């Protein structure tokens, strides 16, 4: 989530 989110 943390990887595609930013």
Request: charged share 75%; proline share 0%.
């Amino acid at each position: 989530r943390r990887x595609x989110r930013f």
